[PDB]
Curated annotation (Swiss-Prot), chain A:
Its main location: plastid. It is found in: Plastid, Chloroplast thylakoid membrane. NDH is composed of at least 16 different subunits, 5 of which are encoded in the nucleus. It is a multi-pass membrane protein. One of its GO terms (cellular component) is chloroplast thylakoid membrane. One of its GO terms (molecular function) is quinone binding. Its EC number is 7.1.1.-. Belongs to the complex I subunit 1 family. It comes from the Eukaryota. It comes from Spinacia oleracea (Spinach). This is NAD(P)H-quinone oxidoreductase subunit 1, chloroplastic. HAMAP family: NDH1_NuoH.
Swiss-Prot record, chain B:
InterPro entries: NADH_UbQ_OxRdtase_chain4L/K, NUOK/Mnh_C1-like. Gene3D superfamilies: 1.10.287.3510. It comes from Spinacia oleracea. GO terms for cellular component: chloroplast thylakoid membrane; NADH dehydrogenase complex. It is a multi-pass membrane protein. GO terms for biological process: ATP synthesis coupled electron transport; photosynthesis, light reaction. The lineage of its organism: Eukaryota, Viridiplantae, Streptophyta, Embryophyta, Tracheophyta. The keyword Transmembrane helix applies. This is NAD(P)H-quinone oxidoreductase subunit 4L, chloroplastic. It catalyses: a plastoquinone + NADH + (n+1) H(+)(in) = a plastoquinol + NAD(+) + n H(+)(out); a plastoquinone + NADPH + (n+1) H(+)(in) = a plastoquinol + NADP(+) + n H(+)(out). The gene is ndhE. NDH shuttles electrons from NAD(P)H:plastoquinone, via FMN and iron-sulfur (Fe-S) centers, to quinones in the photosynthetic chain and possibly in a chloroplast respiratory chain. The immediate electron acceptor for the enzyme in this species is believed to be plastoquinone. Couples the redox reaction to proton translocation, and thus conserves the redox energy in a proton gradient. Belongs to the complex I subunit 4L family. It is an enzyme of class 7 (translocase).
Swiss-Prot record, chain F:
Keywords: Chloroplast, Membrane, NAD, NADP, Plastid, Plastoquinone, Quinone, Thylakoid, Translocase, Transmembrane, Transmembrane helix, Transport. The lineage of its organism: Eukaryota, Viridiplantae, Streptophyta, Embryophyta, Tracheophyta. It comes from Spinacia oleracea. NDH shuttles electrons from NAD(P)H:plastoquinone, via FMN and iron-sulfur (Fe-S) centers, to quinones in the photosynthetic chain and possibly in a chloroplast respiratory chain. The immediate electron acceptor for the enzyme in this species is believed to be plastoquinone. Couples the redox reaction to proton translocation, and thus conserves the redox energy in a proton gradient. The gene is ndhG. It is found in: Plastid, Chloroplast thylakoid membrane. This is NAD(P)H-quinone oxidoreductase subunit 6, chloroplastic.
Swiss-Prot record, chain G:
It catalyses: a plastoquinone + NADH + (n+1) H(+)(in) = a plastoquinol + NAD(+) + n H(+)(out); a plastoquinone + NADPH + (n+1) H(+)(in) = a plastoquinol + NADP(+) + n H(+)(out). The keyword NAD applies. One of its GO terms (molecular function) is NADH dehydrogenase (ubiquinone) activity. It comes from the Eukaryota. Its EC number is 7.1.1.-. NDH shuttles electrons from NAD(P)H:plastoquinone, via FMN and iron-sulfur (Fe-S) centers, to quinones in the photosynthetic chain and possibly in a chloroplast respiratory chain. The immediate electron acceptor for the enzyme in this species is believed to be plastoquinone. Couples the redox reaction to proton translocation, and thus conserves the redox energy in a proton gradient. GO terms for biological process: ATP synthesis coupled electron transport; photosynthesis, light reaction. The keyword Ion transport does not apply. NDH is composed of at least 16 different subunits, 5 of which are encoded in the nucleus. It is a multi-pass membrane protein. This is NAD(P)H-quinone oxidoreductase subunit 2 A, chloroplastic. The chain crosses the membrane at residues 5-25, 38-58, 80-100, 105-125, 130-150, 164-184, 208-228, 276-296, 304-324, 335-355, 376-396, 399-419, 465-485. It is found in: Plastid, Chloroplast thylakoid membrane.
Length: 350, 100, 55, 125, 115, 176, 488
C-alpha cells in the first residue's frame, strides 16, 4: 500500500472511466437517434409526417418513450420463472453492448484496440440468443416459447456466414484488430476499401448482420403478425425497453462493423487521382483530423443505417423454413467460396 | 498473487462434475457434467500455460483441441439421445437396466 | 513524459481547438440544422431528405 | 530448514503463523538476491515472469519489513521505516511499469528498487 | 493496459441493467392483481402450460452448426499466420476447407438440412 | 502485462464464487433447462478466467463454441423431455447421492492436499527459458496461429477428420 | 513457402494417408451416386486396408524418426502394432459387410466409422506427444460411440451406447486431467521423451502431483484395456452391440491401448516404475480373477466373450509388468498376434451362427455339430485356443507369457495366471459340451431349422484365414519372436 502510486492509479481509473461514460451516453443518444430516424424515414416513404408534437420535430419522442417505460409498472408472470425473466434481456443487452469496445472512430479513438478484435465481437454477439431463449422459456407463454426457439434457430443459421465473411476480411488485412483493418484499407485510399475487393463477402455480411439484428425480412422471432410480440409478449416496463435498446444497438454496431470492415472507416482519399478536396481533407491532422474522421465514420454508418430502415418498410418478411434454407444453402457455400477466392488471391502476396 | 486458487477451483469443478456424472437421472445432464469435467481440465491447462508456457502456448492449443473434442461429443450426443427417445420415449438412464 | 507518446501538442492549443469544435457542434450547428429541418420540410427530395437525416 | 517458500503461496499466506524477525531478515536478503538476478529477465522483455516475481516479492516484503522492525535498534527505527516506505514506493512504480509495460521506465524503477533494497539491507545489517 | 478498460467496460455494461431495474422499482408503481398476473393468451384462458416438442428432422441443423463452429474457430489462427508462413499453411487449411465442404455436401444430400 | 494486484485477486475470488454457484446449480437442478442455464454461467466465468490469465483467443473460442453447444443443449432438452416442469425444482436426495457426495469430497480433498502442498511459484522460476517470447511476435493470437500451423499439424487434420465423422454420425443416428 | 518440410514428413504417414484417401473417396462416391452396391464398398474398404499394409511393409527397413515437430514417432515397436491394427480391420471388414447388409441399414457409414477408428488406432500406436495421445484415441472412442449403437432400433443398443458414452466420458477426461497434471508439474513439456528431463529441470520428479498424473493416466488407460474394476463398461456394450463392431472393439481397442500404455509407462514414466508396477500388478491380478470367475456363470455368448477378453488382457499386462529386459514387450506381441486370430475366429463363428440362426443365448448352440460340422469344428478350435489348450496358439502364447514372468521373479503373477487358466477351461468347454449334444429333445428349434446353403460366403474365407492360423502357428512361434525381440 504505497500512497504515491495508489492516488495515481485512482486518477487513472477515473481517466479510463471517463471515455466509458461518454461512450455510454453517446450510445444511448444514438439509440434515440435510430428510433427517431426509423420513424421519420417510415413517415417519409409512406407520405406522412411522423413524430411532430413530442418536441420541435419529434426529437424528444424516443426520450418520452424511454421515460414512459421507466415509469411503467414492471409486470412479472405468476406462472413462469422470475429469475430467467429478469436475466434474459439483461444478458442480451450486455452481450450486445460488449461489442462497442473495439469500434474505432479514429486512429486512436477506440476504447480498446484488442488484437483479438472482431473475433471477440463474434464471440460476445453469440451470447444474446441465449438471453432470448431464457426470456422465451421464463415467460411461460406459447408465443414467447415460439419466439425464443425462432431466435435460436435464426442465430444458429446466420452465425457461420458472418464468421466466414469476417474471416476473409481478417485474412486480407492479416490482422484481427479493427484499426489494422481500417489502416490496411487506407493504404490504397478509396480503391483500397474491402468493398470493391470482396463484394460477395460484402453482400453476405449485410444479409447475415440483418438476420442477426433480427430486422425485417428476418424478424421471425418477433414477428408481430404471427406471434403477438414474440419473446417480448409478456414483457412490460423497463425490460421491453431493454429488449428494444439491445435491438437498435445491434443495428448500430452492425452498421459500424460494415463501415469498418468493408468501407474505409475514417479514411476518405483517392491517391490515384488529383482530388484536391480529398487531399486537403487527409492533410488535416490533430483535433480537427479526428473530428473529420468521426464525421466520415458517422456518415458511412448512416448510409447502412438508412438502407436497413428502408428494408424493414419495403420488403415482405421471410418464413422460418425459407430463412433456414437461405442461411444454410445459399449463404454458407457462397461464403466458403468467397473464403477460397480470398485465399487464392492472397497467395500472390507472399 | 493468489493464482493457485484457480487450480483449486478447477479441482472443485472436476469433483462437482464427477458428482454430477454419477447422480444424473437425465443423460443430457450427464453430458453437461462431462462438459464440466472437460472445462476443469481446460482451466488447469490454461493456467499451466500461463504459468510455464508463455512462449510456446502448448496449453492453450491443448485447450482448443479439448474444446473441439467436447463439441464433437456434444454433437454425437444428443444424437444418441435422439435415437434413445425415438425408440423408448424416456431419458432416465438408471431405469434402463436390461443388460445386466 | 512517458515512453510511447511522441510529439504531442501543447495542452492549451488542444483545449482551444476542442473548445472551438464544441462551440460549433453544440450551440451553432444544431440551430441551423433544426431550422433547415423546419423550413424546407415539404420541399425535400430523396437526396435532401437523406442529407437532412444524416446531419 | 527452509522456513518459507516450501508449500503453496496461499497456504503460507493464510494458514501459517508467520515468520520470526530472524527469518524475516533472511527473506529480505533472498528477495534482494532475486531482484538482482531479475535483470536478465528484465532485459529479455519477459513481462509476465517479471510481474509474477514482483507480486510475490511484494507479498513477502509487506510481512517481512513489518516484522523485522524489532531487529532495528531504536535509534534508527524511524529512518529504517522511511527507507521501507521508499522501497514500497519504488516497487509500486516498478509494478506500474511492468503491467502497462515500458522498457525505459521499468529499468529506471528497477535500478531505484535495487538501490532502495540495498539501503534496507544496510539498515537491517 | 489494453484490458483493464475491457474489465471496466464489462462492469459498467453489467451495472446498467441493474440501474434500470432499480430506477423502475423506485419510480414505477405496483398495482398487482390476479387477473393481471395471468399469462396472456390473446384474450382466451390459456390451456396447458406452453411446450411444443419440435420434430427431430427440423432441428438437425444444430448438430451441423456445432461442428461448423469448431471448424470456423480453427480456421482463424491459420488466417492470422498465413502471411508469416507461406504456401505450407495454404496446403494445410485446404484440406480443412475441403472436409468442411464435403460435410456440407453430405448434410445437403442426406436431407439433414431440409425443412 | 496484467491487471493491478488487488483487482486481479478480487476478480479471481468473485469469478470463483460465480463458478461455484453455477456448478452447484448444474448439479442440483432437476430441470435440464435450469441446469443448462447454470452451465452457461459456468462457461462465461471460465471464459473470463481465460481472459484473466492471458488467453484472449481461447476465451473467445470457448465463448463461441460452448455457447453454440449450450444453445443446442437447451434445444434438445426442450425437445427430448416431458412438460416444462417448473415444479420439479431440485430433485430429491437419496442414499445413492449421499455416498457419492462423500466419495467426491474425498477426491476433492485428495486433489487439494496436493495443490495446497506444492509450491507452484517455485516451478515458474525454474522454467525461465520457456517464458522468453520472440520479440517479433507481438500479437498473442499470431503466436497461437504460428504454433497451431507448424508445431501441431497431425492433430490439426485429425481434428478435421474427427469433426467430419462426428457430423456424419450425428446426422445418421438422429435421423427419423 | 516450400510445402517441403511437411511433404517429406507427410510421406512418413503415407499408410494413414491411404486410409484417409480411401475414406474420402468412399464418402464422395456415396454422396454422388444414388444407387448402392455391395461389391464396390467391399473393394474400396479392402483396397484401402491392403494398400496401407503394402506401404507399411515398404517402410519397415527405414530409419526411426520423429516427424511433424515431435508429433509422430516411427520405429520398430509401433510399426508392428500398426500392422496388427490393419490386420484386425482387414479381417473385420468381411465380418461387417454381411452383418450390416442383413440388417437392411446403410453400410457406407459403418465402413467409414471402421476406417476412421482404424486411422485413429494407427495414430495412437506412434503418438509421440501429449496432444495426439488425446486426439487420436478420440478419433477411436467417438467412432466406437457411433458404432455399437449403429443398430439404432434395438432397445439393447441404445442402453449400450448410453453406458459406453457415459463411461468413456468418465474416462478420457480423468486421463486428460492426468495429462494436465503431468504437463503442469514438468515445465510445459508434452513430447513423450522430453518430460522426464523437464521433471528434473523443475525438480518435481518426486512431487505429490506426479502421483496424481500417474494414477489418472493408469485409470484412463485401464478403462480402454478393461482390466480390473474399470471393466464394467465391457460386458453390457459387448452384450448389446452388433457382433462385427464388438469384435473390432475387442481386437482393435486392446492393441492401440496396449501400445499407448507401453509408450506412456516406459518413455515418460520410467523414474516411478515402482508405483505403476504395483498398479499394473493389481490391475492384472484383479482382471484375471474377476474375468475368469464370472465367465463360468454366463448364459450369453457375447457377454461370456466379454468376460473372456477382460480375462485375457491380464495375461498381456504381465508383458508390460516384467519390462523390456526379460523379453517382455516381445511377449505382448506374439500373444496379441495370437489373440487377434483367436477372438476374430471365435467371433466370425458367432456372426455366421447368429445370422443363420437369429440368437445369442448359449443354450441354442446345442446340436450344431449335427447341422454344420465345419462351423462347430472351427468354433471349438477357436475356443480351445482361447483356453490355452496344448496344440493351439493360446497354449504356446501363455507359456511364452509365463516364461518371462518367471524369469523376472513374478511367481505370484504366474501362479494366478495358471490358476485362472485352469478356471478358464470350464468355459470354452461348456460351449463344446453343448455343441456335441445328440439329444434331439435338448436341441433348440433355433438350430433345427438351420440352412447352411451351397455357397461359401465371405466370413468363411475370413475365418479360414484364421482357424488354420491358431492351429498352424504352433510350429511357427520361432519366426514371430525374432521380429518382436528385434524391437526395443
Ligand atoms: C512338431 C512340429 C515341429 C517339428 C520340430 C521342429 C523342427 C523341424 C526341422 C528343424 C528346424 O530347425 O526347423 C526350423 C524351423 C524353421 O522355422 C523358422 O524358419 C525361418 C525361415 O525363414 C528361419 O529359419 C527361422 O530361424 C526358423 O525358426 O523352425 C520351426 O519353427 C519349425 C516349424 C516350421 C513351421 C512349420 C509349420
Ligand atoms: C460516442 C461516439 C463518439 C466517438 C467515440 C470515440 C471513443 C471514445 O470516446 O473513447 C476514446 C476517446 O479518446 C479521448 O480521450 C477523446 C476524448 C473526447 C471524445 C469526444 C467524442 C478513447 O481513446 P483513448 O486512447 O483516450 O482511450 C483511453 C486511454 O486508453 C487512456 O485511458
Ligand atoms: C430543464 C429540463 C426540463 C425541460 O427542458 O423541459 C422540457 C424537456 O423535459 C421533458 O419533457 C423531459 C425530457 C428531458 C430532456 C419539456 O418541454 P418540451 O420540449 O416538451 O416543450 C417545449 C415545446 O413546447 C415543445 O417542443
Ligand atoms: C467533439 C469533441 C472534440 C473532438 C475530439 C477531441 C479529442 C481528440 C483529439 C485528442 C485525442 C486523439 C489524439 C491523441 C493525441 C493528442 O493530441 O492527445 C491529447 C489528448 O488531449 C486530452 O487530454 C483531451 C482534451 C480534452 C477533450 C475534449 C474537451 C494531448 O493531451 P494530453 O493530456 O495527452 O497531453 C497534454 C500535455 O502535454 C500533458 O500531457
Ligand atoms: C461460389 C458459390 C458456390 C455454390 C453455389 C451456390 C449454391 C448452390 C446453388 C444451387 C442450389 O441452391 O440448389 C438448388 C438446385 O439444386 C439442384 O441442382 C437440385 C438438385 C439437388 C441435388 C441434391 C443436393 C445436392 C446439391 C449440391 C450443391 C452444391 C453443394 C455445396 C458446394 C460448395 C436447390 O436444390 P434443393 O436443395 O432444393 O434440392 C433438393 C431437392 O429435394 C432436389 O433433390
Ligand atoms: C497444388 C495445390 C495448390 C497449389 C499450392 C501453391 C500454389 C503453387 C504456386 C505457389 C507460388 C505462389 O506464390 O503463387 C503464385 C500464383 O500462382 C497461383 O496462384 C497458381 C495456383 C492456382 C490455383 C491454386 C489455388 C487454389 C487451389 C504467385 O507467384 P509468385 O511469383 O509471387 O510466387 C513464386 C514463389 O513460388 C513464391 O513462393
Ligand atoms: C448473471 C448471473 C445472475 C445471478 C444468478 C443467480 C442469482 C442468485 C441465486 C438465486 C437462485 C436462482 O436464480 O435460481 C433460479 C435459477 O437460476 C438461473 O437459472 C439463473 C442462472 C442463469 C445465468 C445465465 C448466465 C449465462 C430459480 O431457482 P429458485 O429456487 O431461486 O426459484 C425459486 C422460484 O421457482 C422462483 O423462480
Ligand atoms: C483376408 C482378406 C479379407 C478380405 C477378402 C475376403 C474375401 C472376399 C471375397 O471372396 O470376395 C468377395 C468380394 O468381391 C468383390 O465383389 C470385391 C472384389 C474383391 C474384394 C476382396 C479382395 C480385395 C483384395 C485383393 C487384392 C488387392 C487388390 C487391390 C490392390 C491391387 C465376393 O463378393 P461377391 O461378388 O460374392 O459379393 C456379392 C454381394 O455380397 C451381393 O450383395
Ligand atoms: C483418383 C480418382 C479415382 C476414382 C475411382 C472411382 C471409380 O473407380 O469410379 C467409381 C465411381 O464412378 C462412377 O460411376 C461415379 C462417378 C464418379 C464419382 C467419383 C467422384 C469423386 C472422386 C474423388 C466406380 O463406380 P462403381 O461401378 O464401383 O459404383 C460406384 C457408384 O458411384 C455407386 O454405386
Ligand atoms: C501373419 C504373419 C505371420 C508371420 C510372418 C513371418 C515371415 C517370415 C520371417 C521374416 C523374417 C525376415 C524379415 C526381418 C525384417 C526385414 C526388414 C527389411 O528389410 O524388410 C524389407 C522387406 O519388407 C518386408 O517384407 C518386411 C515384412 C516382414 C516383417 C514384418 C512381418 C509382419 C509382422 C509380424 C507380426 C523392407 O522393405 P523394402 O521394400 O523397403 O526393402 C527392400 C528389401 O527387401 C530390403 O532392402
Ligand atoms: C493330439 C491332440 C489332438 C486333439 C487336440 C486338437 O488338436 O484339437 C482338436 C482336434 O482337431 C481335429 O478334430 C482335427 C482337425 C483340425 C486339426 C487340428 C490339429 C490336429 C492335431 C495336430 C497335431 C497335434 C480337438 O477337438 P475336435 O476338433 O476334435 O472337436 C470335435 C470336432 O468338432 C469334430 O469335428
Ligand atoms: C439521453 C441519455 C440519458 C441522458 C438517459 C438515457 C435515456 C434513454 C436514452 C432511455 C431509453 C430510450 C430507448 C433509448 C427507449 C425505448 C425506445 C424503443 C427503443 C422504443 C420503442 C417504440 C417503438 C415502440 C419504437 C419503434 C417502432 C416505430 C413505428 O413506427 C412502428 C409502426 C413500430 C411497430 C415500432 O416498433
Amino acid at each position: 500500500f504505497s500512497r504515491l502510486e495508489f492516488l495515481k492509479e485512482v486518477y487513472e481509473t477515473i481517466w479510463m472511466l471517463f471515455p466509458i461514460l461518454i461512450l455510454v451516453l453517446g450510445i444511448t443518444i444514438g439509440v434515440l437517434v435510430i428510433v427517431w430516424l426509423e420513424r421519420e424515414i417510415s413517415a417519409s416513404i409512406q407520405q406522412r409526417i411522423g413524430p411532430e408534437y413530442a418536441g420541435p420535430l419529434g426529437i424528444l419522442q424516443a426520450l418520452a418513450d424511454g421515460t414512459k417505460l421507466l415509469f411503467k409498472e414492471n409486470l412479472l408472470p405468476s406462472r413462469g420463472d422470475t429469475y430467467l425473466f429478469s436475466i434474459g434481456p439483461s444478458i442480451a443487452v450486455i452481450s450486445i453492448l460488449l461489442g462497442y469496445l473495439i469500434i474505432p472512430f479514429g486512429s486512436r479513438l477506440v476504447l480498446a484496440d484488442l488484437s483479438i478484435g472482431v473475433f471477440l465481437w463474434i464471440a460476445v454477439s453469440s451470447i444474446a440468443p441465449i438471453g432470448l431463449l431464457m426470456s422465451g422459456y421464463g415467460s411461460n407463454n406459447k408465443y414467447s416459447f415460439l419466439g425464443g426457439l425462432r431466435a435460436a434457430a435464426q442465430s444458429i443459421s446466420y452465425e457461420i456466414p458472418l464468421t466466414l465473411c469476417v474471416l476473409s476480411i481478417s485474412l486480407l488485412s492479416n490482422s484481427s484488430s479493427t484499426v489494422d483493418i481500417v489502416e490496411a484499407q487506407s493504404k490504397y485510399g478509396f480503391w483500397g476499401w474491402n468493398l470493391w475487393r470482396q463484394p460477395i463477402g460484402f453482400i453476405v455480411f449485410i444479409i447475415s448482420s440483418l438476420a442477426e439484428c433480427e430486422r425485417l425480412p428476418f424478424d421471425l422471432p418477433e414477428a408481430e403478425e404471427e406471434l403477438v410480440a414474440g419473446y417480448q409478449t409478456e414483457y412490460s416496463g423497463i425490460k421491453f425497453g431493454l429488449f428494444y435498446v439491445a435491438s437498435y444497438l445491434n443495428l448500430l454496431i452492425s452498421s459500424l462493423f460494415v463501415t469498418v470492415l468493408y468501407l474505409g472507416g475514417w479514411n476518405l482519399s483517392i491517391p490515384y487521382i488529383f482530388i484536391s478536396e480529398f487531399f486537403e481533407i487527409n492533410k488535416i491532422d490533430g483535433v480537427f483530423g479526428t473530428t473529420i474522421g468521426i464525421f466520415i465514420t458517422l456518415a458511412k454508418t448512416f448510409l447502412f443505417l438508412f438502407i436497413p430502415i428502408t428494408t424493414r418498410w419495403t420488403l415482405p418478411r421471410l418464413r422460418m423454413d425459407q430463412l433456414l434454407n437461405l442461411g444454410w444453402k445459399f449463404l454458407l457455400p457462397i461464403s466458403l467460396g468467397n473464403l477460397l477466392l480470398t485465399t487464392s488471391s492472397q497467395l500472390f502476396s507472399l | 498473487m493468489i493464482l493457485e486458487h484457480v487450480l483449486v477451483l478447477s479441482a472443485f469443478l472436476f469433483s462437482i462434475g464427477i458428482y454430477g456424472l454419477v447422480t444424473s437421472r437425465n443423460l443430457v445432464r450427464a453430458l453437461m457434467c462431462l462438459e464440466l469435467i472437460l472445462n476443469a481440465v481446460n482451466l488447469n491447462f490454461v493456467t499451466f500455460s500461463d504459468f510455464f508456457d508463455s512462449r510456446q502456448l502448448k496449453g492453450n492449443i491443448f485447450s482448443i483441441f479439448v474444446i473441439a473434442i467436447a463439441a464433437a461429443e456434444a454433437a454425437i450426443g444428443p444424437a444418441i439421445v435422439s435415437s434413445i427417445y425415438r425408440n423408448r420415449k424416456s431419458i432416465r438412464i438408471n431405469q434402463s437396466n436390461l443388460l445386466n | 513524459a512517458v515512453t510511447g507518446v511522441n510529439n504531442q501538442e501543447d495542452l492549451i492549443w488542444v483545449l482551444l481547438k476542442a473548445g472551438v469544435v464544441g462551440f460549433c457542434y453544440f450551440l451553432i450547428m444544431p440551430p441551423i440544422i433544426m431550422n433547415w429541418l423546419r423550413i424546407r420540410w415539404y420541399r425535400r427530395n430523396l437526396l435532401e431528405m437523406y442529407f437532412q437525416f444524416m446531419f | 530448514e527452509f522456513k518459507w517458500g516450501t508449500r503453496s503461496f496461499i497456504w503460507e499466506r493464510f494458514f501459517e503463523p508467520g515468520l520470526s524477525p530472524e527469518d524475516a531478515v533472511s527473506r529480505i536478503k533472498n528477495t534482494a538476491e532475486g531482484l538482482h538476478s531479475l535483470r536478465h529477465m528484465l532485459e529479455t522483455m519477459s513481462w509476465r515472469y517479471v510481474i509474477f516475481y514482483i507480486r510475490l516479492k511484494q507479498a513477502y516484503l509487506k510481512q517481512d519489513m513489518k516484522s523485522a522492525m524489532i531487529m532495528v535498534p531504536e535509534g534508527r527505527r524511524d529512518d529504517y521505516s522511511n527507507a521501507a516506505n521508499e522501497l514500497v514506493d519504488n516497487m509500486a512504480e516498478f509494478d506500474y511499469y511492468v503491467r502497462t509495460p515500458k522498457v525505459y521506465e521499468s529499468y529506471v524503477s528497477y535500478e531505484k528498487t535495487l538501490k532502495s533494497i540495498d539501503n534496507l539491507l544496510g539498515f537491517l545489517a | 493496459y489494453e484490458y483493464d478498460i475491457f474489465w471496466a467496460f464489462l462492469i459498467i455494461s453489467s451495472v446498467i441493467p441493474i440501474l434500470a431495474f432499480l430506477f423502475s422499482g423506485i419510480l414505477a408503481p405496483i398495482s398487482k392483481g390476479p387477473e393481471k398476473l395471468s399469462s396472456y393468451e390473446s384474450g382466451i384462458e390459456p390451456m396447458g402450460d406452453a411446450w411444443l416438442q419440435f420434430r427431430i428432422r427440423y432441428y438437425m441443423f444444430a448438430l451441423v452448426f456445432v461442428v461448423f463452429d469448431v471448424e470456423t474457430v480453427f480456421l482463424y489462427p491459420w488466417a492470422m499466420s498465413f502471411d508469416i508462413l507461406g504456401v505450407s499453411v495454404f496446403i494445410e487449411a485446404l484440406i480443412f476447407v475441403l472436409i468442411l465442404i464435403v460435410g456440407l455436401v453430405y448434410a445437403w444430400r442426406k436431407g439433414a438440412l431440409e425443412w | 502485462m496484467d491487471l493491478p494486484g488487488p483487482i486481479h485477486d478480487f476478480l479471481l475470488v468473485f469469478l470463483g464464487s460465480g463458478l461455484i454457484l453455477g456448478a452447484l446449480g448444474v448439479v442440483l437442478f432437476t430441470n435440464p433447462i435450469f441446469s443448462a442455464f447454470s452451465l452457461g454461467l459456468v462457461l462465461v466465468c471460465i471464459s473470463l478466467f481465460y481472459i484473466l490469465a492471458n488467453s484472449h483467443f481461447v476465451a473467445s473460442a470457448q465463448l463461441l463454441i460452448y455457447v453454440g453447444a449450450i444453445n443446442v443443449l437447451i434445444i434438445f432438452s426442450v425437445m427430448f423431455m416431458s412438460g416444462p416442469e417448473y415444479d420439479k425444482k431440485f430433485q430429491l436426495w437419496t442414499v445413492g447421492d449421499g455416498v457419492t457426495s462423500l466419495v467426491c469430497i474425498s477426491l476433492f480433498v485428495s486433489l487439494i492436499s496436493t495443490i495446497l502442498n506444492t509450491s507452484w511459484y517455485g516451478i515458474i522460476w525454474t522454467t525461465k527459458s520457456n517464458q522468453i517470447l520472440e520479440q517479433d511476435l507481438i500479437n498473442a493470437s499470431q503466436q497461437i496461429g504460428i504454433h497451431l500451423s507448424t508445431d501441431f499439424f497431425l492433430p490439426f487434420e485429425l481434428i478435421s477428420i474427427i469433426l467430419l465423422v462426428s457430423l456424419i454420425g450425428a446426422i445418421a443416428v438422429a435421423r427419423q | 513457402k516450400a510445402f517441403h518440410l511437411l511433404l517429406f514428413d507427410g510421406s512418413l504417414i503415407f499408410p494413414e494417408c491411404i486410409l484417409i484417401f480411401g475414406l474420402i473417396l468412399l464418402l464422395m462416391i456415396d454422396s454422388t451416386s444414388d444407387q448402392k452396391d455391395i461389391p464396390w464398398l467391399y473393394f474400396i474398404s479392402s483396397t484401402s486396408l491392403v494398400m496401407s499394409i503394402t506401404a507399411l511393409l515398404f517402410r519397415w527397413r527405414e530409419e526411426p524418426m520423429i516427424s511433424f515437430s515431435g508429433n509422430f514417432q516411427t520405429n520398430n515397436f509401433n510399426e508392428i502394432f500398426q500392422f496388427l491394427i490393419l490386420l484386425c480391420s482387414t479381417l473385420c471388414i468381411p465380418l461387417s459387410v454381411e452383418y450390416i447388409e442383413c440388417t437392411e441399414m446403410a453400410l457406407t457409414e459403418f465402413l467409414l466409422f471402421i476406417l476412421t477408428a482404424t486411422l485413429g488406432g494407427m495414430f495412437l500406436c506412434g503418438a509421440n506427444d501429449l496432444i495426439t495421445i488425446f486426439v487420436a484415441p478420440e478419433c477411436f472412442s467417438l467412432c466406437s460411440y457411433l458404432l455399437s449403437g449403429y443398430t439404432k432400433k434395438d432397445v439393447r443398443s441404445n442402453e449400450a451406447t448410453t453406458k459406453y458414452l457415459l463411461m468413456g466420458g468418465a474416462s478420457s477426461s480423468i486421463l486428460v486431467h492426468g495429462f494436465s497434471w503431468l504437463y503442469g508439474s514438468s515445465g510445459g513439456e508434452i513430447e513423450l521423451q522430453e518430460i522426464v528431463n523437464g521433471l528434473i529441470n523443475t525438480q518435481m520428479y518426486n512431487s505429490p502431483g506426479i502421483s496424481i498424473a500417474l494414477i489418472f493416466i493408469t485409470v484412463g488407460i485401464g478403462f480402454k484395456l478393461s482390466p480390473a474394476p474399470s471393466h464394467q463398461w465391457t460386458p453390457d456394450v459387448y452384450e448389446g452391440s452388433p457382433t462385427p463392431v464388438v469384435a473390432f472393439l475387442s481386437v482393435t481397442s486392446k492393441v492401440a491401448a496396449s501400445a499407448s500404455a507401453t509408450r506412456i509407462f516406459d518413455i515418460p514414466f520410467y523414474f516411478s516404475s515402482n508405483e505403476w508396477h504395483l498398479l499394473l500388478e493389481i490391475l492384472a491380478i484383479l482382471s484375471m480373477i474377476l474375468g475368469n470367475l464370472i465367465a463360468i456363470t454366463q448364459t450369453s455368448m457375447k457377454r461370456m466373450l466379454a468376460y473372456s477378453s477382460i480375462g485375457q488382457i491380464g495375461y498381456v499386462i504381465i508383458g508390460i509388468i516384467v519390462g523390456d529386459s526379460n523379453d517382455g514387450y516381445a511377449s505382448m506381441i506374439t500373444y496379441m498376434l495370437f489373440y487377434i486370430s483367436m477372438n476374430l475366429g471365435t467371433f466370425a463363428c458367432i456372426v455366421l451362427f447368429g445370422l443363420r440362426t437369429g440368437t445369442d443365448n448359449i443354450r441354442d448352440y446345442a446340436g450344431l455339430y449335427t447341422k454344420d460340422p465345419f462351423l462347430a469344428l472351427s468354433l471349438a478350435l477357436c475356443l480351445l485356443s482361447l483356453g490355452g489348450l496344448p496344440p493351439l496358439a493360446g497354449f504356446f502364447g501363455k507359456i511364452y507369457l509365463f516364461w518371462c514372468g518367471w524369469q523376472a521373479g513374478l511367481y505370484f503373477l504366474v501362479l494366478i495366471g495358471l490358476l485362472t487358466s485352469v478356471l478358464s477351461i470350464y468355459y470354452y468347454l461348456k460351449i463344446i459340451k453343448l455343441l456335441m449334444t445328440g439329444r434331439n429333445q435338448e436341441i433348440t428349434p433355433h438350430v433345427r431349422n438351420y440352412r447352411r446353403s451351397p455357397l461359401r460366403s465371405k466370413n468363411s474365407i475370413e475365418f479360414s484365414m484364421i482357424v488354420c492360423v491358431i492351429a498352424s502357428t504352433i510350429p511357427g512361434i520361432s519366426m514371430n519372436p525374432i521380429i518382436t525381440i528385434a524391437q526395443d
